[PDB]
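Could someone model sodium ion with this protein?
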Amino acid sequence: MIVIPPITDRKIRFALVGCGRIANNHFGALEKHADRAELIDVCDIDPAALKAAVERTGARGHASLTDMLAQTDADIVILTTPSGLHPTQSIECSEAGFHVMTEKPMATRWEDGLEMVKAADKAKKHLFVVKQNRRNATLQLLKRAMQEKRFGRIYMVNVNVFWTRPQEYYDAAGWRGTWEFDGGAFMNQASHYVDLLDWLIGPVESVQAYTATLARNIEVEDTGTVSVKWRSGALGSMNVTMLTYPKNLEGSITILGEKGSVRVGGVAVNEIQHWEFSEPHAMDEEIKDASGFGHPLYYDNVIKTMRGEATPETDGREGLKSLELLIAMYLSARDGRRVSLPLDY
Amino acid sequence: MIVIPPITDRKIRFALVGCGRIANNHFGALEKHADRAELIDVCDIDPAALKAAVERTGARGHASLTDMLAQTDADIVILTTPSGLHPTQSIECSEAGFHVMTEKPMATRWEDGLEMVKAADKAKKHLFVVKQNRRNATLQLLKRAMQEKRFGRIYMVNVNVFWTRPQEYYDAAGWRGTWEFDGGAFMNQASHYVDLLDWLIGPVESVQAYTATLARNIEVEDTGTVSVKWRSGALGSMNVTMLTYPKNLEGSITILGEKGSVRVGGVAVNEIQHWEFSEPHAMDEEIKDASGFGHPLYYDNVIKTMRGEATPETDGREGLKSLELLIAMYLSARDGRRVSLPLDY
Amino acid sequence: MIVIPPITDRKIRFALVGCGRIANNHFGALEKHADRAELIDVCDIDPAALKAAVERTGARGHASLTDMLAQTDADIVILTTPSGLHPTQSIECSEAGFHVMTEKPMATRWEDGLEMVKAADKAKKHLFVVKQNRRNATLQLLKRAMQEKRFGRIYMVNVNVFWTRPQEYYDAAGWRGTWEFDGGAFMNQASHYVDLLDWLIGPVESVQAYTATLARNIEVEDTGTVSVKWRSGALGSMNVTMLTYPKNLEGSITILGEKGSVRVGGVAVNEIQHWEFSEPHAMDEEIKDASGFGHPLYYDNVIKTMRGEATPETDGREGLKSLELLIAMYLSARDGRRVSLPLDY
Amino acid sequence: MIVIPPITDRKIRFALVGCGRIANNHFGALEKHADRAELIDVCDIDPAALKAAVERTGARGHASLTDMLAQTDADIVILTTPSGLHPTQSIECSEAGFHVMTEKPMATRWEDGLEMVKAADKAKKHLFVVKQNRRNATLQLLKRAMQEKRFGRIYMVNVNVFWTRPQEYYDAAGWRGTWEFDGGAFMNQASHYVDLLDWLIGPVESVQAYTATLARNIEVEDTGTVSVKWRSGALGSMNVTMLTYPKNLEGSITILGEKGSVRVGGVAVNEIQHWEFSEPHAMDEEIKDASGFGHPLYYDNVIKTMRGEATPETDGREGLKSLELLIAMYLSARDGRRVSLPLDY
Ligand SMILES: NC(=O)C1=CN([C@@H]2O[C@H](COP(=O)(O)OP(=O)(O)OC[C@H]3O[C@@H](n4cnc5c(N)ncnc54)[C@H](O)[C@@H]3O)[C@@H](O)[C@H]2O)C=CC1
Ligand SMILES: NC(=O)C1=CN([C@@H]2O[C@H](COP(=O)(O)OP(=O)(O)OC[C@H]3O[C@@H](n4cnc5c(N)ncnc54)[C@H](O)[C@@H]3O)[C@@H](O)[C@H]2O)C=CC1
Ligand SMILES: NC(=O)C1=CN([C@@H]2O[C@H](COP(=O)(O)OP(=O)(O)OC[C@H]3O[C@@H](n4cnc5c(N)ncnc54)[C@H](O)[C@@H]3O)[C@@H](O)[C@H]2O)C=CC1
Ligand SMILES: NC(=O)C1=CN([C@@H]2O[C@H](COP(=O)(O)OP(=O)(O)OC[C@H]3O[C@@H](n4cnc5c(N)ncnc54)[C@H](O)[C@@H]3O)[C@@H](O)[C@H]2O)C=CC1
Ligand SMILES: CC(=O)N[C@H]1[C@@H](OP(=O)(O)OP(=O)(O)OC[C@H]2O[C@@H](n3ccc(=O)[nH]c3=O)[C@H](O)[C@@H]2O)O[C@H](C(=O)O)[C@@H](O)[C@@H]1O
Ligand SMILES: CC(=O)N[C@H]1[C@@H](OP(=O)(O)OP(=O)(O)OC[C@H]2O[C@@H](n3ccc(=O)[nH]c3=O)[C@H](O)[C@@H]2O)O[C@H](C(=O)O)[C@@H](O)[C@@H]1O
Ligand SMILES: CC(=O)N[C@H]1[C@@H](OP(=O)(O)OP(=O)(O)OC[C@H]2O[C@@H](n3ccc(=O)[nH]c3=O)[C@H](O)[C@@H]2O)O[C@H](C(=O)O)[C@@H](O)[C@@H]1O
Ligand SMILES: CC(=O)N[C@H]1[C@@H](OP(=O)(O)OP(=O)(O)OC[C@H]2O[C@@H](n3ccc(=O)[nH]c3=O)[C@H](O)[C@@H]2O)O[C@H](C(=O)O)[C@@H](O)[C@@H]1O
Ligand SMILES: [Cl-]
Ligand SMILES: [Cl-]
Ligand SMILES: [Cl-]
Ligand SMILES: [Cl-]
Ligand code: NA
Ligand code: NA
Ligand code: NA
Ligand code: NA
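Reply:
Sure, complex below.
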């Protein structure tokens, strides 16, 4: 990271590639931030999807990324393509001189994640990874409790993601449900919960995982469980399935330590259900209210970074922390063995 | 198992060894069943504990098991001694011609469990193992739902035992907190929940476990997590700690299958919290009411068995199913490897 | 094996324990051989099954094996009980001074098989294991071709047992479908085909196996496949399932060597389907006709042995050859690893 | 994959490198499709083989691939060279701006297969892999039955390739019978049957393999067997030998599921021998008739793709599915261990 000069007297310019489902949320976010930011170029290999985006946003349209990169003077290129394409696209963006914002997960394979970080490092350009859930109110209070050491020593952690994805979800596009482009219940659907393991609880020492495809016609897991050991000695598990009858049931985390016990549950870690500490704290009166956000807030940090006003909340190197866990869980489930971190020396 | 003749025209006679804490619950149970059963002999190596039992129950007292066995004409000898003594005591009882009822867990080491079953087999006498929680109302409804196949294919299971045991609990006696005589959070405190894994969900294929002593001054685990794979493909985890702040928090099970989702929680699997099936069933109207029992009910089955009126709900061979899981979890945690079942060919 | 004196001037005396399904075939066999042999004592722990046997055969009845052994002057005690009981019963017979004929498989666990052989050795009494299929006409021609070296070097072997067993088969009795008493598709249903691996092809070096319970509600496998390597370098596989739609389809073996190719198929290795050798042989004209037997013939060898006229076709030591393969296949499937022979040094 | 523009108003142009045995079948195929396609350039490092091709086809001749690539304006470059050369040649073609059609197998080493896909991806050009057997009538009906779910849950699969290749087959050229350029019984001779494992039955979880050179003077296997486990739980084996006495005997597949049992056999999966489903289907009346094709049909799809009329039936990414199985079988046979998929995270 060299010092990069702030961008001062114009809006920040965005280009976007992959005009599908979540691109809608990025369009909305950018619309909100229209005084500080504009979307000037969009790219999709499917003419209709590209048509809809160009008509909605007013941006110029392009049929390939390589062409858009030859033309755009965007500051940042946003990757909202299938997950397994993020690495090659990010590296091409970096090598052409652009900051990159990649949707999660940043890669589907470990060396691809590493290579996208190395390319951004060498270009002296930012790589932002979208982890928009971290700023949720419940997850912020948890993070604050952790930063203050309210739990003392952590002993036990349980994360559950009991959700529902029918066959028609995976059949919506060829990329979905594939190792190369998607990953399964852990790498795609529950990835914002995998993220909590290192971000809230701290460095992981090792994992032991089982995964399976118990019902869907896909090659990735629809169901999995992982035993986790933290370098602090804390132990825990994360359990996920997309096969829950008959709709989404639970997105929860329970954290138990020496001097505190918390559970945040609901369908999406959205309800503080248990909140008990050995000593009270100012933050405790926000607890009913804790129970925009998402992409719009994420974009405020990216904009501030470009203006010299802040630093990335989640850069490529931060993204590697949860990717390395996902890849250790996948190796452990594949080979039936404990896999320890870090993956590389 | 040869046919044994029913006992018809007298009360069933019990002797008991180990006049400590849970012996209180056996005394109460036997007092309840006083028309069908009597306690005629009690044994403890500690004079005071033995004194209290003899004065409460009226039974004759003995200072060693070997002496009591030379004297008593009990039908059944009840073992309420430290866990690691059950095997040698059971085998001595069997070899002297008595049916044995052992408190859980039946043994602390795998070959010791096997040997107590082999000795009872060779004597053609019963070995009952006390699993008094199975007849709890919540756990009975769950079992019934399982027997009816209400879930269809099971996908995902989570068991949590988040309880509290302070140092003074373990320091109460030398045997407690030791591998040889006790075992830890899984083998002692949460053993009635380990029991659910095979009894409710079915045959286990393998486990992967971590355990640790994170706070107590004992050699066994105070905290653990186990990843479980069932032969049906179902996956799950069980998470336990005795370090919960500041008192018992949760004893729960969640079961997710193709056509059903259930959670029974509370501090002791005592509250049906989620109960959703694809088709209704008669058993569904008992659900508020589900939310004596324990030892007294256990004793009714043991009495009925002795009278020819039933068969054991939980004999030594049934007890080996959860013991084999505990021993696989302990081997897996010790060696950091997946351990698959059955343990012996 | 000491020299045992022939039995000359009376019929050979049999006792039988376990008056169930295959005991019918032993009764028939003994009825056939009524001039050389008689059944004088029968034993079953179920009063009705014992009643039926006593009324059919005229033998005296007993309610326990231990009693029958105290009374009978049988030469041989026949074990037609659940498989997992054969070892303890055989050892008791041997230790009481009787020759034993055990139904297959001889044991369900390796050390139990070893112990029954050791006990018969120490008693200087025979242990016969029932492998009645070996004398089938098709299997005899195959064996003869092997003994003559008609194939030259063996290269490739495939055995398929594609059969059908519905849930009601396993539910018929508690012992069925259990590791301890039965074993699964390999150890029970297809055991006469496992037998061919060492008996026809020769010493096995190692196996690699997968097994699963894909549909039945039992703890043993309903489906399996094993990769086999012979010490000669020959390779092969055996594939079994009890889940075949909608009835028994195939019991076959294919053997390929340097100078010969054979397939014997049908539902039960009963049809010579392919029979091609580099040089013709006298045995080749029996080939249409090859395409009593069973228990009656087995009994002729047992009778002849007792009369000094022959030696056992299949004694306990011969039975250990296929048991050791089954146990290596079970260990390999359980642990996901190649298992090499012999099991013990 | 960018959108590539269709080729409309001329024939598609082909160039071919490696004017040996199977190039004959490509010449024939191209002759058939002479109104839509022409072969304009041929390449061989052996002057005579090149002479014969140029005189047969009328194409211009070249002595090196690098020269032909500098000259030809072919749309597609066809690789009919030794297998181990396909990757370097494909990558050179891609980097020079050509679509590539490679003969099977696409590579002999895993990273080489990956690299040829990566190079075609980066060039935005097609990589077709020749799997001409998939459109065989028998294999199409099987595929259709699979797509319709006629079997319900699959339980058991057996593939046998019992064929004959004498020493003179391998001695025909230096490349044959070598790991680097050929592979053995699985990667070369039976590769169209390995292909069925993922294409018909679905994603594979793991394999366990033995291979050997039992008779031929080559370094690759002439004989092998593989135990296979599918992610669905289905199990099976594939058995291959090139040592069959005295000529090709069997190319078969047997598939057993919940509600269907099929066997397609003959010398080359060319005879529907067993075809039994729980419910009839329109496709069932084609069954006698099922019992051009090959390269000519393959070429119709390649031509249609170039004309915008279809997409590849088998592109490089599709080719990686069977290559990854072959490489897992080779690693498993080499190291004597179960090898699980996918190979890369
Ligand atoms: N942050 C979050 O919470 C979420 C993130 N995502 C991530 O967003 C990405 C997109 O997911 P969706 O929008 O759901 O998928 P989608 O299938 O709806 O979007 C696919 C878009 O990319 C286009 N495309 C494919 N290849 C391309 C190429 N080479 N060049 C240009 N465009 C190409 C497709 O034509 C399509 O319009 C994935 O990485 C996913 O993990 C998705 C949902 C939630
Ligand atoms: N079913 C359930 O839910 C429960 C079962 N238990 C089981 O009951 C057993 C007893 O636990 P506690 O009553 O809590 O322990 P305790 O320490 O209160 O009881 C110990 C008794 O055994 C006596 N003793 C020790 N060695 C002896 C010997 N060689 N001969 C005769 N007496 C001897 C001690 O003097 C003492 O009175 C353990 O196996 C435990 O796992 C305990 C609590 C709950
Ligand atoms: N050679 C072959 O081809 C076959 C061999 N078998 C073998 O025969 C044995 C019996 O199988 P089935 O006759 O099918 O089973 P079964 O369940 O029909 O026979 C069970 C008999 O043993 C009795 N029994 C159980 N425990 C006993 C005890 N402790 N003492 C005395 N009797 C006892 C039961 O009451 C019952 O009558 C098994 O080992 C089986 O593997 C069975 C079928 C085929
Ligand atoms: N799809 C199918 O069913 C079949 C596919 N094949 C595949 O086709 C390929 C060729 O096999 P064959 O035609 O049987 O072999 P071959 O040995 O008959 O053909 C070899 C040709 O390539 C030439 N050659 C070697 N190195 C070269 C180079 N650097 N540049 C140019 N030419 C070179 C040789 O001189 C020779 O004419 C192999 O990959 C094989 O696996 C072969 C038979 C069947
Ligand atoms: C914040 C967060 O955790 N986000 C994750 C989350 O996103 P998002 O909230 O947008 O999903 P959304 O709830 O709309 O359901 C999506 C489909 O589910 C099906 N769906 C959903 C719920 C249900 O009960 N049943 C059901 O069929 C139905 O088909 C829906 O169309 O799911 C994304 C995904 O899976 O691709 C993950 O990638 C994200 O990490
Ligand atoms: C049915 C069931 O699951 N039984 C298990 C259960 O039994 P039982 O219910 O009798 O325990 P009980 O709740 O009385 O607390 C015991 C001590 O805990 C301490 N204790 C308890 C709760 C708490 O909040 N804090 C605390 O210190 C306090 O010191 C208590 O004296 O705990 C047993 C044990 O541990 O030996 C297990 O062996 C049993 O399997
Ligand atoms: C010689 C040989 O290989 N013997 C083996 C064989 O014996 P035996 O031939 O006597 O079986 P038998 O064919 O009568 O079917 C038995 C039941 O199958 C069910 N059965 C059978 C066939 C079928 O199509 N469908 C079916 O339901 C039906 O319920 C039948 O009642 O099966 C025995 C068994 O399994 O215990 C194995 O232990 C033996 O090794
Ligand atoms: C469709 C299919 O499965 N194709 C595979 C198949 O191709 P193709 O059908 O063209 O073989 P072909 O039957 O002509 O015999 C070839 C030689 O075998 C010898 N051969 C053959 C049969 C026999 O009985 N004896 C014999 O010596 C004789 O020397 C023959 O010259 O064999 C190819 C090969 O091996 O290189 C595999 O690469 C292909 O995957
Ligand atoms: Cl919740
Ligand atoms: Cl709760
Ligand atoms: Cl057949
Ligand atoms: Cl055939
Ligand atoms: Na898995
Ligand atoms: Na531990
Ligand atoms: Na298995
Ligand atoms: Na090999």
